[PDB]
Design a protein around this ligand. Structure first.
Ligand SMILES: [Zn+2]
Lengths: 481, 45, 349, 57, 109
């Protein structure tokens, strides 16, 4: 403990306690006896005209009458205050380096897991989807630790997480990429685009030392951007050796035929050309671990080639259907019916993806936006943009002001199921073409192909020419009969 | 829950050592301390 | 296509403005002679501000000033001034991105960029918003009240709205919205949300809040606060003279809380529409004491306490119209208002 | 209250010859820019004054 | 009102930068007329967290409970006349809070 005495103790009895009798004017023994002082000073009368400029003023360097014999204090250096304030304004983050990276690491860790479980709820793909995804990143982590020391090139990127989920899904081979991406954007199924979730509140603050803040969808994918990292992850992963049948899916073909001019025959046509020179009669697999940092026209992005065969098939098939199985007036009817139209969720989604306002292929639909499409758009904004967010501080005043403002314009709401489903729309346009049974048709064919180029290209990293660069590639591949 | 009433909005609230001394429903900067169910004896004279 | 709610992705635009100005002060300087970040602040300290309005439009009917300057421009004379500022732009041009090298080499040739900076930003946050802004402008251009309101209500909940259109489409949408709200409320909420009774302007690079359509109080008349008073007098007129009343008083006391500072301190509309609200309060009282001598056969009704209450006013309002003229107010065609007021005082006889 | 400088919990005592009751306690954050610490408090005391020998009438 | 007549009677306070200009000097180195044109008094207002804190009309009860003054912003239109009129400058300067009388033509009650 501290001691007593920093003023007085009763030298009579050894009782080191002190009483104050303010009525007496006396400092006395708390336990025992006597007068600790008869003298008592400063409780002035009725005479303080205050002429005294009394410039002095206490400032704790001349001590004090000590009128508390009660004490404990401590040795002081001289006004903690600055050290006190330094300590109050300390708990923040002020980190950086390996430590910051570990939590940057951690946060990345968590959001992916949150991503995966919505994955299960949406797809109901049992322990299986969950555990494969976990070891996939366990494998990813393995590599990160090795080149540690102070290496802080963890790639990841807003893209890396979905590449991870993508590769894991392919191992399992549940779906597709474009479909997955459009679905995800449309329903914000992924926690992908905003990184505020986590349960970081704190990770947010850990002055995620430059790292973390870089979290949060930062932006939407360009041309490559996303197929490139998948390759990096595979090289990171050595994924092809580890997992079976990657990039495959007779389901992407189905998705694609139904996508539009779904021809109860073009599935087998394109499946056949794929059969053909499409990797020698074999389901093309996940490209490799493009180890090199330059990431060139890998192009063996299997799907990228699937869409290419898809397109090719259509015009080849349709611009030498000698037997005339596909009528002149039939081709434009399909492209016809195609013109825009609502979407039991899908087309509305593709509008939401179009609105990344990229290379201006959908920008104008931006403009046009077929009436309601306009309406169900604002509907999806009032539901799925709300998370939007929650000024912290800056007046519990402006927060209030903001609230008031919102209240003011209160916005929202100052046979049913109109937006029919997907296979409903699909049915009704193949019916809209159900009347089935020279220069112009060539033009029509080109017209139609540009459209699909729009569609397939729009879900994906496009390259208003890589696409065709891609196209060009297999064109060349083909003529070695 | 300790309580503090806004002198101008009537809104009951419960300020903390971690919040601004202001009426959270109006923005006032004056708060009446609410009475609670606290036992007090009184000599009836 | 329309004007976006947000601070402009400050990344390349801020270094393009370094190269633009730095060249203009360099070529600037050698002309000044050819006549004997900070650079950007110095360009405005050399050129100046525009005042609280838009375009320093000011008459053109006073000072002759003989501009004969004379074709003073011999292709040969331009390339004497230019040959040295371009080599000094290169230095900083090298440290600049390849996109900003030719952006500079385009504007230094006099080419203008058909690449709207708000036609490339690719930020989820942003993008959408541009998505929105254009939707609501295409919906008011076809009067779609039930859909323009939904897009407007979502546009302010997303973190990117500075009053901006937020007020200029937030008022009409409430005039076109036959349902809930009187731009008024929203207008009076704005007035309190943008009094900024602070006198300032100039100084720093207003590059996200330029628009004399938000800002003011300490000179720079706000125009939503002037629109609040104008919409309020038109909201007082409808179905008056066709204790729950008060509105024409509420507007007399809300304009009085002012009394010179920024608003009257500044003149016009302020004084003028104050008088106009006041002139309307004089007519209503002549009607409520007008038709066929007041209401009818005479007044006997204790002389005319009501005529004296009205003549006091008529005398006052002529004081407000006069001080609005005297203090430089070009707004008022005095001849018509004086003739109306005298032909009206007549009715009071 | 507590002052970090003294690391002690201190109190302001009431000093009078007779008891009162606290009628209202008002917390003053007003005129403040931040004042998050709640540094001004107004306490009103109720002292009952019963007619008593020597009171003037 | 009385206060504006008072400010019209105090008139001007003239000062010469000491004539310089090198008759330049003797005949003053330009006149610097100064004065106060108008004087306005406003009803008590308080904006918190400074600018950007919608203002509220302040009522006396608050001034009493806070144990503080009940001030009105006092403003006066300053006239800065240069060279007797060669250049005129107006500025209304805020001169702090003038204590307002209750139930006066300047108190909310
Ligand atoms: Zn309140």
């Amino acid at each position: 403990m501290s001691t007593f005495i920093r003023g007085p103790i009763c030298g009579t009895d050894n009782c080191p306690s002190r009483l104050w009798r303010i009525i007496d004017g006396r400092r006395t023994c708390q336990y025992g006896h006597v007068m600790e002082g008869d003298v008592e000073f400063n409780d002035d009368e009725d005479d303080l005209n205050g002429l005294g400029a009394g410039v002095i003023t206490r400032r704790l360097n001349l001590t004090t009458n000590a009128t508390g014999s009660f004490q404990s204090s401590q040795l002081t250096n001289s006004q903690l205050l600055q050290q006190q304030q330094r300590q109050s304004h300390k708990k923040f983050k002020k980190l950086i380096g390996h430590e910051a990276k570990l939590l940057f690491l951690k946060s990345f860790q968590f959001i992916l897991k949150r991503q995966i479980r919505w994955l299960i709820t949406e797809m109901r793909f049992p322990k299986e989807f969950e555990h494969v995804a976990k070891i996939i990143w366990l494998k990813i982590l393995k590599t990160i630790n090795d080149q540690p020391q102070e290496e802080l090139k963890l790639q990841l990127h807003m893209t890396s997480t979905i590449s991870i989920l993508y590769l894991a899904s392919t191992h399992l081979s549940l779906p597709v990429y474009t479909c997955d991406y459009i679905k995800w954007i449309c329903t914000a199924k992924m926690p992908y685009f905003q990184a505020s979730e986590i349960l970081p509140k704190s990770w947010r603050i850990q002055l995620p030392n430059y790292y973390v803040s870089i979290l949060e969808g930062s932006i939407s994918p360009f041309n490559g951007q996303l197929y490139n990292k998948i390759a990096l992850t595979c090289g990171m992963i050595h994924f092809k050796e580890f997992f079976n049948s990657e990039i495959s899916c007779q389901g992407l073909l189905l998705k694609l035929v139904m996508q539009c001019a779904l021809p109860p025959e073009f599935y087998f046509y394109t499946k056949q050309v794929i059969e053909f020179e499409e990797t020698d009669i074999r389901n093309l697999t996940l490209w490799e671990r493009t180890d090199e940092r330059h990431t060139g026209r890998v192009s063996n992005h299997a799907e990228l080639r699937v869409l290419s065969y898809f397109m090719l098939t259509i015009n080849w098939m349709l611009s030498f259907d000698r037997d005339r199985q596909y009528p002149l007036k039939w081709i434009l009817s399909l492209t016809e019916s195609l013109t825009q139209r609502t979407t039991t969720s899908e087309s509305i989604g593709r509008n939401i993806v179009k609105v990344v306002y990229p290379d201006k292929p959908t920008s104008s639909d931006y403009f046009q936006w077929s009436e309601e499409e306009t309406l169900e758009f604002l509907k999806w904004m009032e539901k799925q943009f709300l998370p939007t967010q929650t000024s912290m501080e800056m007046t519990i005043d402006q927060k209030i002001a903001r609230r008031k403002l919102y209240k003011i314009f209160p916005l929202d709401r100052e046979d049913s199921t109109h937006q029919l489903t997907f296979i409903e729309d699909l049915q009704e346009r193949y019916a809209k073409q159900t009347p089935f049974f020279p220069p112009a048709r060539k033009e029509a064919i080109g017209r139609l192909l540009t459209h699909i180029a729009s569609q397939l290209l729009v879900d994906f990293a496009i390259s208003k020419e890589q696409l065709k660069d891609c196209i060009s590639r297999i064109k060349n591949a083909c003529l070695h009969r | 829950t300790l309580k503090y009433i806004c002198a101008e909005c009537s809104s009951k609230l419960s300020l903390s050592r971690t919040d601004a001394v202001r009426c959270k429903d109006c923005g006032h900067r004056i708060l009446l301390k609410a009475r609670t169910k606290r036992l007090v004896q009184f000599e009836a004279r | 296509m329309f004007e976006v709610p947000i601070t402009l992705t400050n990344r390349k635009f801020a270094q393009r403005r370094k190269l633009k100005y730095q060249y203009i002060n360099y070529i600037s300087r050698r002309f000044d002679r050819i006549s004997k970040s900070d650079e950007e602040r110095k360009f405005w300290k050399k050129y100046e501000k525009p005042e609280k309005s838009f375009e320093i439009w000011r008459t053109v009917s006073s000072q002759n000033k003989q501009p004969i300057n004379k074709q003073k421009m011999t292709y040969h004379n331009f390339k004497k001034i230019e040959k040295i500022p371009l080599r000094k732009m290169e230095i900083p041009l090298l440290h600049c991105t390849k996109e900003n090298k030719l952006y500079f080499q385009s504007i230094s040739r006099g080419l203008e960029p058909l690449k709207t900076s708000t036609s490339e930003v690719r930020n989820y946050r942003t993008r959408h918003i541009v998505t929105l802004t254009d939707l609501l402008h295409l919906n008011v251009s076809r009067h779609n009240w039930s859909l323009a309101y939904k897009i407007f209500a979502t546009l302010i909940r997303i973190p990117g709205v500075q009053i901006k259109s937020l007020w200029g489409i937030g008022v009409e949408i409430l005039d076109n919205l036959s349902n809930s709200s009187s731009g008024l409320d929203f207008l009076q909420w704005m007035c309190q949300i943008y009094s900024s009774k602070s006198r300032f302007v100039q100084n720093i690079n207003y590059r996200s809040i330029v628009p004399p359509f938000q800002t003011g109080s300490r000179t720079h008349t706000a125009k939503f606060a002037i629109t609040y008073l104008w919409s309020s007098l038109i909201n007082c007129q409808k179905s008056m003279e066709p204790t729950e009343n008060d509105l024409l008083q509420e507007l007399i006391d809300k304009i009085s809380e002012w009394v010179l500072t920024p608003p009257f301190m500044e003149d016009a509309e302020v004084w003028f529409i104050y008088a106009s609200c006041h002139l309307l309060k004089a007519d209503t009282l002549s009607r409520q004491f007008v038709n066929d001598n007041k209401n009818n056969d005479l007044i006997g009704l204790d002389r005319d306490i009501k005529i004296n209450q009205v003549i006091k006013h008529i005398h006052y309002v002529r004081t407000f119209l006069k001080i609005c003229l005297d203090k430089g107010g070009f707004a008022v065609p005095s001849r018509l208002i004086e003739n109306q007021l005298k032909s009206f005082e007549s009715r009071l006889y | 209250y507590f002052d970090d400088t003294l690391n002690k919990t201190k109190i302001k005592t009431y000093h009078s010859s007779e008891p009162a009751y606290i009628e209202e306690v008002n917390l003053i954050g007003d005129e403040s820019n931040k004042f998050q610490e709640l540094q001004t408090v107004s306490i009103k005391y109720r002292i009952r004054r019963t007619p008593q020998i020597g009171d003037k009438f | 009102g009385l206060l504006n007549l008072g400010v019209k009677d105090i008139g001007e306070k003239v000062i010469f930068d000491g004539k310089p200009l090198n008759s330049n000097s003797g005949y003053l180195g330009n006149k610097l007329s100064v004065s106060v044109e108008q004087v306005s008094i406003a009803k008590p207002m308080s904006n918190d967290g400074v600018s950007s804190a919608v203002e509220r009309k302040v009522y006396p009860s608050e001034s009493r409970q806070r144990l503080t003054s009940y001030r009105g912003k006092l403003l006066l239109k300053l006239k800065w006349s240069v060279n007797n009129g060669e250049e005129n400058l107006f500025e209304v300067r805020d001169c702090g809070g003038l204590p307002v009388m209750l139930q006066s033509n300047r108190c909310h009650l």
